[PDB]
Design a protein around this ligand. Structure first.
Ligand SMILES: [Mg+2]
Ligand SMILES: [Mg+2]
Ligand SMILES: [Mg+2]
Ligand SMILES: [Mg+2]
Ligand SMILES: [Zn+2]
Ligand SMILES: [Zn+2]
Lengths: 205, 148, 42, 157, 140, 118, 146, 80, 37
RNA sequence: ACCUCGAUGUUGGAUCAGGACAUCCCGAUGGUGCAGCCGCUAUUAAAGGUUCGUUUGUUCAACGAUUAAAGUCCUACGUGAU
RNA sequence: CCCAUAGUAGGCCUAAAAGCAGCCACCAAUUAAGAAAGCGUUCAAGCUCAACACAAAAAUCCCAAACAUAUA
């Protein structure tokens, strides 16, 4: 089945209980599906965000149309929309309780791989439409091969090791130098200053 | 001689659903104005026109404005007229939907969708605060073939 | 060109920019505290 | 506002100063480094063999001809034992010094097409060239004896 | 300008494949098919034949012809009327190397087709590749 | 010589002087070049006006400012003059102004190929 | 330098060509600028330096011929544009407001009718960013925008 | 264009300008539309002559010239 | 001219030129391709 | 739900209009499925203009007749110590 | 930038689809050009290509004036 599988709008059995909007699921680096699996090419998420069924349909249609079924194959590296987002009836004042489940979505964290391509095909043969899909995506995304991913990572360690600035965000935050922990989040100690909200700053060491 | 044309009638505006509120009358009642009708596309026969070069291959009947607040209605879509030579057979699927031979003759190809009602339209003694606002009906979209 | 609401508090605030003078002040304080760390380390 | 926002939230001025102070600083690589200081062998052996196989050689500039005209010229040449050859100057320039042809250096530049043979049908070849008033005969070197065009004409006559 | 056609010698006036295609430049279809039938009489009858007609600017015909096609020739040699579908695994007829050589003997002789390579290898390899692309196996 | 001032960058075209006559639609925005052509003194006058302190003494100070577009100056003003201030910007020299001795002194930087049109 | 002369019969003659001054301060350098130790020490008004890479009518000379680095060629081109706009090359012309350090062509910049607020002011560029790495003899870095 | 003649002496010091000139312009890729011309390559400082039977003769001593210069001059003269 | 934030050459003859302060895609064969930044 | 509940009802209309241009017309251009006329689309332009009637408070809307056009808005849904 | 012969219109398919509607194969000559990468073709014909050679906009009127280079 060398084609991208269809993703349902919502799980067959919905969540009766409304759950809170824990934005930590979008905040911070991704810890799952951060490495290539049975593929060579992928769309890397350079920022956190929520993927709707609309985004899923966009990705599926574009990739299926613009890939060769016999040689190129695609695989989802993100679960189908499962987190329920509730929208109150339009035009109602605040209060009265949490609204009903309007839609379903899937969280995605920075560094996460959304779709993974593979097969007998080089990187430039796929860069075009993968980058178009990345631009379409709701968060900063990049068409990254295994080689490009490793290259950018190694460049990150190179920047960290050769930066001539005596002062690093990690050093200052961990040491609580200027009392800056009065202004930083406890998560900043682990984000090392490279993450702000759902945005990831690759340029920053 | 022969032209395939895509006439798309206008779409009626969707009625608004709002409610009035003024200093000394807070619950002033519905203000949802009705939407304007879509402008029909009518092929009018023209004696001066002798060939179907003039007629375009894509006609989009103007859509009516949506109803506003304060019971404001929506300007209905203006009628789009396609000047055609005298003696122009109009066929959908080999149906000869029209002949259009006489001067002054005209055939309505795509009727603009009617405008949607507002809540004030449904206002009544029984219904003292309607929330309904019927959506503006879509306009007709058909492919007509013109043969001299 | 006006900033909606009240400056420095709302979602839309006056953009604030760091001057070289501010960076130098912060670096000076950081150096002082690095020396403090060294002298507390023994 | 929440910790995560659809827009880039405004950092506290202290955090902004922290980020600015901790920005990355690349190293300066001293003085600017930039401002600081088997088809090939197949052709090699083929040309080495050809230089001995051939007894008479000439060169021309058959680049002004079309596909069909070049094909017709090829058939006319194959009517005789003469074989036409094409090789890059990039690899022929070494071949001149390799085979000890110093006088041949200012002859092979641009499109050069050899006409190796052992029996001169040069009379009929020049006759064929005559009806096409272009494509001049160029200098050559028969049996290690450089011949100019006048030499070729004398040898033909 | 040169016009290339693969018409069958048996039927000199198929119609569309010659009329509209040749009429753009301006031709005499009667003379064209008369010369085509003359060549058909000169050669065996009922076989596709490539043509090398060159419509001169003077509105004159210079019809040049050579050997029959290669695909139909190989199919007939193998006793095949329609070529194989897969052509990678399917096969309908087998032709021996000796037969291939024999047919090649009368192949590298045409001028327009440019099949004038002195070595036998250049022609035998080409025809072998053509047969392989076709649904024909090369015996031994 | 206020007519002969020079702006750095593209200020001649980018810098805009805005005034408003007070009447509706009386907002006039005139580029620096247009203002200079209209009045060869307005640019310097406005620069000095904007640099002076914003109090009641500003116009008394401006009364002491004498701006002349060209070399000509009134005889009484010339007799009044006491000192000449050094020009804030040293005017760069042109090639036409450079002496042949300086041209020879400055080394040739590169060997131009002989076979070049130039 | 070869010049084409007509009389129609036309022919080219090679005339006297200048040569690099003897004893470069830094031999074995990539570009002439580096060879002569001028990496960050020439400005738009250094006409003596600039004109050595200039066609007689004012156009720049190709990098292949000049031998300059890519960045040095860009810097020279920008400095030459600035010098021409400042009128420092009166003799290198194709056949009145005084300016200098003009980054953009005078006829391609629109007036700043609505300068932004203090935090988003629309500044007028001065000089060129390509010369941002020039030698800095001042306490404060030179401002490229005014 | 009426007639053209190209002459060069590769036996003497080589001059690639005229060689490239005759390789480029003196090709049937151009003569197909410029059929009016009559080319001749009499080879033996070099010389390219162009005879316009109306009133003109253009002589090019393509020693110090280059292919681009001589082609541009030829095109300009053809435009006349 | 069509105003585009990203200028793309459509055919072979389309050429990019920076005129009067902004980029333009000019085309002789298909002047339909005229684009302005 | 942040100012005003220790005399400002509100919507329309009249009067006068100030302003933005995201231009309805008039001006200048590019493209066109631009032969011409009509047009469609885009750039630039806000100096000037942008109708009168029937029903209905009505803004709006429908309809009648026109116009080069009968533009979208903001101005305390401009203006009621007029 | 230059430049393009050709087994042949590779077969099946189809009225016919010939590199280019689809399927199977993708070999093969000439020093070299894919049984074709895109246009174009009803189909052809023709064009090149890979070859060989060589960012923004709103409504009273923009909004300190300015300044690129004298030493920390
Ligand atoms: Mg405020
Ligand atoms: Mg509260
Ligand atoms: Mg505008
Ligand atoms: Mg409001
Ligand atoms: Zn250098
Ligand atoms: Zn184009």
């Amino acid at each position: 089945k060398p084609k991208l599988r269809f993703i349902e709008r919502a799980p067959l059995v919905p969540k009766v209980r409304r759950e809170p909007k824990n934005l930590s699921d979008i905040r911070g680096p991704s810890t799952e599906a951060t490495e290539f699996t049975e593929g060579n090419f992928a769309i890397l998420a350079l920022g956190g965000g929520y993927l709707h069924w609309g985004h899923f349909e966009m990705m599926r249609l574009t990739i299926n149309r613009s890939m060769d079924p016999k040689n190129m194959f695609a695989i989802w590296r993100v679960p189908a929309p499962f987190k329920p987002i509730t929208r109150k009836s339009v035009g109602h004042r605040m209060g009265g309780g949490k609204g009903a489940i309007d839609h379903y979505v899937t969280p995605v964290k920075a560094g996460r791989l959304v779709v993974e391509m593979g097969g007998r095909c080089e990187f430039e043969e796929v860069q075009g439409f993968l980058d178009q899909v990345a631009h379409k995506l709701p968060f900063a995304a990049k068409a990254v091969s295994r080689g490009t991913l490793e290259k950018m990572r190694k460049d990150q360690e190179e920047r960290e090791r050769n930066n001539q600035n005596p002062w690093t965000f990690e050093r200052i935050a961990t040491a609580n130098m200027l009392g800056i922990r009065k202004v930083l989040s406890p998560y900043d100690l682990t984000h090392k200053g490279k993450y702000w909200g759902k945005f990831y700053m690759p340029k920053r060491v | 001689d022969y032209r395939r044309v895509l006439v798309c009638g206008g779409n009626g505006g969707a009625g608004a659903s709002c409610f009035h509120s003024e200093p000394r009358k807070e619950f002033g009642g519905p203000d949802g104005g009705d939407g304007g009708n879509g402008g029909h596309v009518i092929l009018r026969v023209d004696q001066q026109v002798k060939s179907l070069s003039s007629v375009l291959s894509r006609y989009q009947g103007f859509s009516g404005e949506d109803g506003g607040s304060k019971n404001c209605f929506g300007r209905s879509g203006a009628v789009l007229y396609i000047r055609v030579p005298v003696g122009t057979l109009v066929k959908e699927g080999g149906r000869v939907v029209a002949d259009l031979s006489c001067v002054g003759d005209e055939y309505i190809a795509a009727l603009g969708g009617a405008g949607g009602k507002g809540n004030r339209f449904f206002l009544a003694n029984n219904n003292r605060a309607p929330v309904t606002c019927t959506p503006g009906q879509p306009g007709q979209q058909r492919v007509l073939h013109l043969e001299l | 060109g006006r900033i909606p609401g009240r400056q420095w508090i709302g979602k839309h605030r006056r953009p604030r920019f760091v001057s070289l003078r501010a960076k130098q002040n912060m670096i000076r304080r950081l150096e002082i505290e690095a020396e403090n760390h060294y002298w507390l380390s023994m | 506002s929440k910790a995560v926002t659809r827009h880039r939230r405004v950092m506290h001025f202290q955090r902004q100063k922290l980020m600015a102070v901790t920005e990355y600083i690349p190293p300066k690589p001293a003085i600017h480094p930039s401002c600081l200081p088997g088809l090939i062998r197949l052709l090699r052996r083929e040309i080495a063999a050809v230089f001995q196989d051939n007894r008479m050689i000439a060169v021309c500039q058959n680049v002004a001809l079309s596909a069909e005209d070049k094909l017709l010229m090829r058939h006319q040449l194959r009517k005789h034992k003469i074989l036409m050859k094409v090789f890059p100057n990039q690899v022929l320039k070494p071949f001149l010094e390799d085979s000890k042809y110093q006088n041949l250096l200012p002859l092979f530049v641009g499109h050069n097409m050899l006409l190796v043979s052992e029996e001169p049908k040069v009379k009929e070849m020049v006759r064929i060239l005559r009806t096409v008033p272009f494509l001049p005969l160029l200098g050559g070197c028969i049996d290690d004896t450089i011949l100019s065009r006048q030499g070729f004409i004398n040898y033909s006559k | 300008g040169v016009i290339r056609a693969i018409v069958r010698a048996g039927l000199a006036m198929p119609g569309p494949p010659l009329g509209p295609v040749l009429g753009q430049r301006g031709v005499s279809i009667n003379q064209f098919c008369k010369e085509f039938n003359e060549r058909t009489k000169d050669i065996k009858e009922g076989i596709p034949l490539p043509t090398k007609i060159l419509v001169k600017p003077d509105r004159t015909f210079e019809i040049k012809i050579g050997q029959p096609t290669v695909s139909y020739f190989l199919k007939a040699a193998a006793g095949i009327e329609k070529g194989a579908r897969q052509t990678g695994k399917e096969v309908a007829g087998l032709v021996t190397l000796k037969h291939v050589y024999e047919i090649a003997r009368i192949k590298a002789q045409d001028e327009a087709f440019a099949l004038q390579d002195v070595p036998l290898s250049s022609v035998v390899r080409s025809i072998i590749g053509s047969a392989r692309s076709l649904g024909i196996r090369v015996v031994k | 010589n206020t007519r002969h001032i020079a702006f750095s960058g593209n200020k001649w075209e980018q810098k805009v002087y805005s005034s408003h006559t007070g009447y509706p639609g009386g907002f006039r925005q005139v580029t620096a070049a247009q203002l200079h052509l209209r009045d060869p003194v307005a640019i310097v006058k406005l620069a000095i006006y904007g640099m002076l302190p914003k109090n009641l003494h500003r116009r008394t100070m401006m009364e002491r400012l004498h701006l002349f577009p060209d070399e000509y100056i009134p005889e009484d003003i010339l007799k009044n003059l006491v000192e000449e201030l050094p020009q804030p910007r040293k005017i760069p020299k042109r090639l036409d102004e450079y002496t042949q001795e300086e041209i020879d002194a400055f080394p040739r930087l590169w060997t131009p190929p002989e076979d070049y049109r130039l | 330098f070869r010049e084409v002369v007509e009389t129609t019969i036309i022919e080219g003659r090679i005339t006297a060509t200048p040569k690099e001054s003897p004893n470069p301060p830094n031999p074995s350098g990539q570009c002439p600028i580096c060879r002569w130790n001028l990496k960050h020490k020439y400005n738009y008004d250094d006409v003596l330096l600039l004109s050595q890479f200039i066609r007689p009518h004012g156009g720049m000379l190709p990098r292949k011929i000049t031998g300059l680095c890519q960045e040095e060629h860009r810097k020279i081109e920008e400095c030459v544009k600035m010098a021409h706009r400042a009128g420092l090359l009166p003799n290198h012309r194709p056949r009145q407001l005084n300016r200098y350090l003009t980054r953009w062509a005078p006829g391609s910049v629109k007036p700043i009718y609505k300068k932004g607020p203090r935090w988003n002011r629309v500044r007028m560029p001065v000089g060129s960013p390509l010369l941002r790495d020039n030698v800095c003899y001042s306490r404060t870095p030179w401002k490229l925008y005014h | 264009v009426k007639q053209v003649r190209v002459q060069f002496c590769p036996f003497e010091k080589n001059v690639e300008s005229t060689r490239t000139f005759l390789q480029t312009v003196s090709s049937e890729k151009v003569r197909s539309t410029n059929l009016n011309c009559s080319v001749i390559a009499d080879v033996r400082e070099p010389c390219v002559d162009v005879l316009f039977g109306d009133g003109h003769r253009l002589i090019m001593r393509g020693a110090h010239l280059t292919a681009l210069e001589m082609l541009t001059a030829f095109a300009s003269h053809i435009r006349a | 001219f069509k105003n585009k934030t990203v200028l793309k050459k459509r055919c072979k003859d389309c050429y990019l030129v920076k005129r009067r302060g902004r980029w333009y895609v000019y085309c002789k064969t298909h002047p339909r391709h005229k684009q302005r930044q």
